[PDB]
Design a protein around this ligand. Sequence first.
Ligand SMILES: CC(C)CCC[C@@H](C)[C@H]1CC[C@H]2[C@@H]3CC=C4C[C@@H](O)CC[C@]4(C)[C@H]3CC[C@]12C
Ligand SMILES: CC(C)CCC[C@@H](C)[C@H]1CC[C@H]2[C@@H]3CC=C4C[C@@H](O)CC[C@]4(C)[C@H]3CC[C@]12C
Ligand SMILES: CC(C)CCC[C@@H](C)[C@H]1CC[C@H]2[C@@H]3CC=C4C[C@@H](O)CC[C@]4(C)[C@H]3CC[C@]12C
Lengths: 278, 278, 278
Amino acid sequence: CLKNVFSVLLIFIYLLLMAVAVFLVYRTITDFREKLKHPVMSVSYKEVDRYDAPGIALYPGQAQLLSCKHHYEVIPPLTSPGQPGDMNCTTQRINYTDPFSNQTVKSALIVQGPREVKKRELVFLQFRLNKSSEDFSAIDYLLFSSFQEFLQSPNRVGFMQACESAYSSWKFSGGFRTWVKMSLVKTKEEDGREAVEFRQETSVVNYIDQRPAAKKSAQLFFVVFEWKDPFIQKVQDIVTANPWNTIALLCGAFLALFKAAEFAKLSIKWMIKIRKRY
Amino acid sequence: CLKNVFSVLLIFIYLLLMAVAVFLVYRTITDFREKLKHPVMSVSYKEVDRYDAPGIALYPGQAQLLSCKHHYEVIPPLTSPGQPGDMNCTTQRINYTDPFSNQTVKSALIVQGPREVKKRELVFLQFRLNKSSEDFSAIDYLLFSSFQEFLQSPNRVGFMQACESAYSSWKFSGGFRTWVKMSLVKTKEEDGREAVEFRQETSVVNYIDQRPAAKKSAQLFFVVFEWKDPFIQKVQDIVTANPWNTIALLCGAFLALFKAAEFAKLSIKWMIKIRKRY
Amino acid sequence: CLKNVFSVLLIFIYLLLMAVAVFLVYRTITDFREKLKHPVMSVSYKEVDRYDAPGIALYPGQAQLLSCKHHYEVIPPLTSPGQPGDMNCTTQRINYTDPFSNQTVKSALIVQGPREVKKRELVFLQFRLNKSSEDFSAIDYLLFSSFQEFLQSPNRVGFMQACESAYSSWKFSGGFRTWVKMSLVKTKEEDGREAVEFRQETSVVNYIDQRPAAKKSAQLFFVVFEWKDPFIQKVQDIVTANPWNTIALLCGAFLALFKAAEFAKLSIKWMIKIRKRY
Ligand SMILES: CC(C)CCC[C@@H](C)[C@H]1CC[C@H]2[C@@H]3CC=C4C[C@@H](O)CC[C@]4(C)[C@H]3CC[C@]12C
Ligand SMILES: CC(C)CCC[C@@H](C)[C@H]1CC[C@H]2[C@@H]3CC=C4C[C@@H](O)CC[C@]4(C)[C@H]3CC[C@]12C
Ligand SMILES: CC(C)CCC[C@@H](C)[C@H]1CC[C@H]2[C@@H]3CC=C4C[C@@H](O)CC[C@]4(C)[C@H]3CC[C@]12C
């Protein structure tokens, strides 16, 4: 009767503790799986006094590089457009076959980019393309981390074929002065290596072709490559769920439930004492 | 005297354990509230072999669509600007009333965008606007996820009025070839639905109008829509704080404090034994 | 013999529990250090009915501000380019010395930017630069949070010298209508103050200079400053590791290990009872 009712109610509350433990374990499994599916990303900005000289692989095609200069000032000085000028950059011409065509072979002009961002160093390039019939004259450029790595790397063709994939390729148009402010984003993945990518913001400024004012009629390309700021953006995903913390938390919960059960036994004893007193 | 001093000191240390428990509970409350206020964002890039044909709602106004083409090559071929050309895209003209004017009715030309990013497929559009007096000629365009969803959706006016809000609208100018490299960002919120948005990077290339070299004097708009890469950016916030883990951790802490109290009792017994030995 | 083997095996399992505790503590140390090194970033978009009037510090140089207007419509109305027009904005001219030159003194024209994003308010500025010989005509502009803060701040020179550092400076070119859609990103760091930065997306539209069609031959700069959307992006790093949670979890683990040890003692007693029964 009453004794049996109390006994079955208390075995029921013990089963309730066991069910709470099982529900906690199931919720832990689900939360661990969800956390594994969705690692959380962290971004840290690491300042560098001077950047490693980037490699700017340009694809002029028929465009003739009139001049290349390294300018430490915030702006390039006045120029003499349309004619060859002094060249003061490090260039390397390489003809590789892009893996995505495998048939067409492209010639690239790798230029050593600016190093000292703190001095606002920039590289100013001027190309000239003779009369053409394309109606849209632009030159492709691809940025990769280090020009020296390219120089001292065997099978430079292999290095370039890796860049045509691991790096994006943009365009700069004629009749502008495409000012490219570039930044480094290094993403760290779980499987070791850290991948470096080039972000770049482009600002086009019209070129005033009133100076020739003659039958020149030849496209002029002006470009400036410069580092946006001394900060490299390190981005890495973090696996918020690790087995050891989960095991420790579940063990603590199980210990708490066990002490709850022994407290229930002590409550049994207390009720027995109260009944005895009556 | 000494007995009373020890007794009050030990009830004090028990109260110290209780105060440590209360401080831990208060810190847990504050941390849980702060974590609820600030869920942490996670980004995952999901690769798709081919994108769902996006809908490009253009607003030419008086501009006449000279031609539309789907080009699988990395570049469009040579054109014949200023004159009507072959049209090889899927277009649908719809006149809806934008909810933000509610009075002005705008006509849109929905074009089926490129699907196969892996083939570097792009859609090249050419419009011609006769002589005008605006001094700034540009055409609005709005990107939405699926053109087929628009086709097979009742009250297409309602669908477009939803896009004039759930999607951004940019411009492309005349005298350029606006190359738009577009990407999909899908943000998952707590309350169910996942919202898709279009990021886009635009590269303007001057159009060489030397080919006409006559009294044509009519604005020409050239646009290229292309997928930047096969990766859709899934972004979702994660509520790092859940009640069950907090309860388990607090229960473990309380169990530890209880065992500390019973260890203090055992220390009482040990001191009593030491005194007895003397 | 067997008794000694069992005794040494069980002191070995006790040492195994101690070693598991030590390994858990070491893993906790490593995880806490890694989490401290890499706080996780959270982004929240806070909607604002109207923005605080931003300050647009322009650097015309010799360019003459033909006109400034506040337009609530989505587009500016028709203009009369090349000639002075009505001015209806709040401007303040200040000549400060940029800390990075310390020798060159720059004159800035601070304009009160648009406030009511919800009305799609924008500020349209027109400058005229007489015949020059630069070949690349552009005007620098720098955005800072509040124009009123600049007005009611002593040593306005100090305020501007702070902006030439805490804010980025972009350019807008002549012959375009640079449409600048700007947004606010507020980053909260551990050491108190919250830093406000201006993101901006720029859309250049060719200016049709056919209206003059004469010997005017003077550069015209057109700019539109407008808020991209009513959402300010709050970004803050979160230190996922706090000492109290780590202590609670480790204490729970230690309690679990202690109960495992006492369960091992109970297993000793159970084996002794079984042997006695035989
Ligand atoms: C093996 C590689 C691919 C990683 C994925 C393995 C994951 C899914 C496994 C490894 C450790 C597991 C945890 C370890 C043990 C337990 C036992 C008990 O506490 C229930 C939950 C809990 C906490 C498990 C959740 C799932 C888990 C996280
Ligand atoms: C109800 C919706 C809006 C979500 C917000 C409810 C939040 C604030 C409540 C629900 C569960 C609560 C927790 C649950 C119970 C306890 C009891 C004891 O452990 C103290 C802290 C702790 C851990 C609380 C912190 C605040 C809490 C997180
Ligand atoms: C002091 C400022 C610079 C912050 C850095 C101090 C960090 C490294 C210290 C402070 C609290 C420490 C924790 C506190 C105490 C313990 C004791 C035991 O549980 C081992 C791990 C654990 C959990 C430590 C991990 C390292 C720790 C996180």
